[PDB]
Ligand SMILES: CCCc1nc(C)c2c(=O)nc(-c3cc(S(=O)(=O)N4CCN(CC)CC4)ccc3OCC)[nH]n12
Ligand SMILES: [Mg+2]
């Protein structure tokens with residue numbers, strides 16, 4: 215409708231309000247936003263992806279995100295997808311990626327939490343759940359999001375990559391597995407370290423653009439691009455960030471309550487009777503989100519400064535909410 219088109223004017227912008235597109239699209243923010251991104255970037259025409267097939271697939275994907283999970287639902291997938299879309303347009307990475315690398319990064323963004331049960335890897339491992347027995351305790355959820363994501367391409371009327379060559383499906387697949395497995399938080403300190411090495415030897419050509427020799431370097435930036443996108447919540451406007459914070463904290467406290475009914479040890483932050491939301495956001499930003507984004511800002515100097523300033527204002531806001 216009208217309100218939806220006005221809200222979509224900010225598609226290429228960090229300030230887009232995905233909460234508002236969710237309301238104007240009959241709660242189909244992922245289908246909605248992915249259709250917009252794919253059209254704007256001409257991915258449908260480029261890869262001969264039928265509009266019909268694409269909607270069918272995105273709708274089914276969207277239905278695999280549980281709407282009863284407070285944070286990890288299709289709204290979150292849509293926010294990560296749209297943030298990734300904005301990140302691929304950083305001036306510093308202009309014309310560096312192939313359309314296939316762009317296709318892969320946004321496709322990964324969309325599936326990266328599909329069928330999330332609302333609990334963490336450590337909870338699934340500690341409760342001997344079926345998926346942890348299946349995946350041998352390694353990146354249990356991430357491996358599953360990928361399995362579910364790719365399993366839905368196995369029906370002609372849903373195969374969005376049908377018209378790619380065999381070579382492009384093989385490459386796109388490698389890239390997506392690699393990007394989604396990189397959203398596993400237990401790999402954060404390893405990724406951030408390799409990204410700080412990427413920055414130290416970073417090269418920028420005469421045109422103000424980064425030089426990525428070959429595939430190893432390009433996929434490194436892409437793994438990090440989607441990792442930051444997945445942790446982009448405290449870098450948005452204080453109004454969006456407070457809503458995201460209330461969601462994630464609802465999920466975490468829900469997990470602590472499950473942990474409590476079983477007699478398991480409750481992690482100091484999922485413990486609703488004690489945990490200070492405010493203090494845990496400030497520790498989240500200081501020890502994890504700011505180091506990641508400060509490093510991303512260095513790689514893309516100066517395109518991510520506005521994002522760093524917002525981060526430091528949101529942290530400062532949250533810090534002022536504790537006596
Ligand atoms: C206090 C909530 C902090 C918070 N706010 C936001 C917006 C987010 C967010 O997007 N993602 C993360 C987030 C943070 C961690 S963690 O490293 O901080 N950590 C969680 C707590 N446990 C058990 C005690 C140890 C590991 C793990 C997973 C997370 O979700 C990302 C998929 N946390 N987060
Ligand atoms: Mg995840």
Ligand SMILES: [Zn+2]
Nearest residue numbers: 294326327444
């Ligand atoms: Zn996520």
